[PDB]
Amino acid sequence: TVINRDGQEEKQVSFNSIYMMADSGARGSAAQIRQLAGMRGLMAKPDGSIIETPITANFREGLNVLQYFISTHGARKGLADTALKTANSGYLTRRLVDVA
């Protein structure tokens, strides 16, 4: 956003809803805002090998089929990691509480 009606132009911090809602720190961060407009970055196969051709389209433009397939690799791995890491976290906190 650049606003001026009293003479020369002057830049200012934008009012854009996504940027306001991210800079304010309410919800979202650099990663998510980047994924909305910019290319959504590098995603890795479950082996850990990073795919040569990453998703070159954001969420505003549509993700073609294979880009979505890579994205679901990532998301499924994340959900499984959550579901099978909560167990280790619970065990660790139980052990710590029963020590001290």
Binding site: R95, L96, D98, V99
Partner: protein, 66 residues
Amino acid sequence: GITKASLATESFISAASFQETTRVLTEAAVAGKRDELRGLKENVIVGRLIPAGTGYAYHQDRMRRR
């Protein structure tokens, strides 16, 4: 370690409530251990005032009286 530190406690009740109940109970029975129930889990199991917060005065009275 935390596991071994909690398993090897002066009072068998805490370790028994922790993992390895069979081994801890076997150790206590063989050695004829005795419990002073001076912890938190132990009083919780017994079901009396905790020696942590508002019950600390009550346990101070306990230590005074005997």
